[PDB]
Design a protein around this ligand. Structure first.
Ligand SMILES: *[C@H](O)[C@H](C[C@@H]1CCNC1=O)NC(=O)[C@H](CC1CC1)NC(=O)OCc1ccccc1
Ligand SMILES: *[C@H](O)[C@H](C[C@@H]1CCNC1=O)NC(=O)[C@H](CC1CC1)NC(=O)OCc1ccccc1
Lengths: 306, 306
């Protein structure tokens, strides 16, 4: 038993990280088959980035201006192009360690693992959720751009995120591997507002189920509620509205625990209105929303990948 | 910026996990050079485990009774022996993916990454601390035994933990890779008490520094304190006593932040005596103690491994 914020094993992604260098800028790239993906601002200088004309800047670059290094060995660049906010460098060598993979554009509320890298080398791995306002709450320093977020489905790696920037509020923004930003962001160094950020209600409920599965049940009550009445309290506390689709998604956990979804909503209501009153749930004094249902079932049935 | 509970990249350990099967019991083993390490209770049956006579049980086993599988390929067992609470199976094949490695016995308060496995296959990776009472707060299900905890020093993997059991309080216990338990535990299915568990004071202070480095500073005050006066409040709240050695260890963080260690202790005093009063620090409503100083410096300077 026990419940921990767990990342996917990172091995298959580790073998795809490379170092990409254009002038004095170095960041991380992702090497799959004979293509290296990285953020296009690798071609900027410190002054470019207030308002880069990326098309104009890339025209001044040729293949040999891109230095790509995987470990100690240099890759030869034989073609370059820009897709949205990412650069694709065609290299002479197919990555022998390329995993089975997919590019996916994830939905808000979904989670994924981040392999934080510097200079093409892994620093660490952690779990993140795509917030409803399309930011993530990561740990990223200068040089971290091009680090990626991924899920693993048995043997397939689904890449979903590439890191590009930090917003004034300290949160992080990035693109899918087609180079489209999540959210309204652009790759220039200006003040940019994210949304008002909301709490992922279905994830909170899933974590309350995890807590019950794992011996924490003090927060359970004798009340119930309705979808509309709960939703009415959701808006108050800036929670996403709960839908029948979410209820259905919680079905397995409601079945495992014998606790109807609306009964759990009622418990969640007395937690929002009354706070936790000094208590804790699964070692936290806050309501956690970065576990999908689906995450919860994964830990509690021991799913594996290798 | 940002601060996240980050695990080491798991690739080098992933290539060492195998499946070990003796009768109907299956668990994980660690394959390094031509040796597979696993918990010795792989030789028990469900009734043995109340009071196993491990020496007697192992005598009934021969090499061919141990089925070791790395992926789809079977390893041949050519010798077996018991060292403390671990079994060492000598196999005919040296693991081609063996990393540079060390076995180490970690100290309470130190942290390490856990690669949670089932049937020889990775499920996920997360960070843990060795608690002062020699337990860890993990996520482990049936079948997880033999999963290991490790650190990485550039290219060297230091294995420090192998999982064996869950205690009645829901926490986890295990051995070093020489098969000696951390703490007073024995590998039998009885009620076993861990210590009173204390809070790792130096780690809390390091996390308060991380919070300051990362823009959270509301908890800072105009007071200071003395080592003995703070320690006197430490005992009250069941914190480890703070020593000059700890102060010295915090030196770099005190230098980075310009906040003297004893000034931070004073802030920690008004947090313990007054609680957080509804506020948060680095996204938590509790005082976190599973970051060593050393962890904090690692994230905040971007250390890498590959
Ligand atoms: C690329 O590695 C870097 C990641 C930033 C660095 C600090 N924390 C991060 O997440 N991204 C940038 O430097 C981008 C440049 C892109 C063209 C926009 N700019 C940026 O993030 O500005 C905010 C910032 C915050 C703190 C320190 C430096 C820059
Ligand atoms: C081995 O895989 C397993 C790990 C336990 C299983 C549940 N959570 C864990 O951490 N270890 C055991 O089954 C050991 C057997 C060793 C000889 C002592 N026994 C044990 O942990 O008993 C407690 C327990 C708790 C919950 C479910 C089963 C067993």
């Amino acid at each position: 038993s026990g419940f921990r914020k767990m990342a996917f094993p990172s091995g298959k992604v580790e073998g795809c990280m490379v170092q990409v260098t254009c002038g004095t800028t170095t960041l991380n790239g992702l090497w799959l088959d004979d293509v290296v993906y990285c953020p296009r601002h690798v071609i900027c200088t410190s002054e470019d980035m207030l308002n880069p004309n990326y098309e104009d800047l890339l025209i001044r670059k040729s293949n040999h201006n891109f230095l790509v290094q995987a470990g100690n060995v240099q890759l030869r660049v034989i073609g370059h192009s820009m897709q949205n906010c990412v650069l694709k460098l065609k290299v002479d060598t197919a990555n022998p360690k390329t995993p089975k993979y997919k590019f996916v554009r994830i939905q808000p509320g979904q989670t994924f693992s981040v392999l934080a890298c510097y200079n093409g080398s892994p620093s660490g791995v952690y779990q993140c959720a795509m917030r409803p306002n399309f930011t993530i709450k990561g740990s990223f320093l200068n040089g971290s751009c091009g680090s990626v977020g991924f899920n693993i489905d048995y043997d397939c790696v689904s890449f979903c995120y590439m890191h590009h920037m930090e917003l004034p509020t300290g949160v992080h923004a990035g693109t899918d591997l087609e180079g489209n930003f999540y959210g309204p962001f652009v790759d220039r160094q200006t003040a940019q507002a994210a949304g008002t950020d909301t709490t992922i209600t279905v994830n909170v409920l899933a974590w309350l189920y995890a807590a019950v599965i794992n011996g924490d049940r003090w927060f359970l009550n004798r009340f119930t509620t309705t979808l509309n009445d709960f939703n009415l309290v959701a808006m108050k506390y800036n929670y996403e509205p709960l839908t029948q689709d979410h209820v259905d998604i919680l079905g397995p956990l409601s079945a495992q625990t014998g606790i109807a979804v609306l009964d759990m909503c009622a418990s969640l209501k007395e937690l929002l209105q009354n706070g936790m009153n000094g208590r804790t749930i699964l070692g936290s004094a806050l309501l956690e929303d970065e576990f999908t249902p689906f995450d919860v079932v994964r830990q509690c049935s021991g799913v594996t990948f290798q």
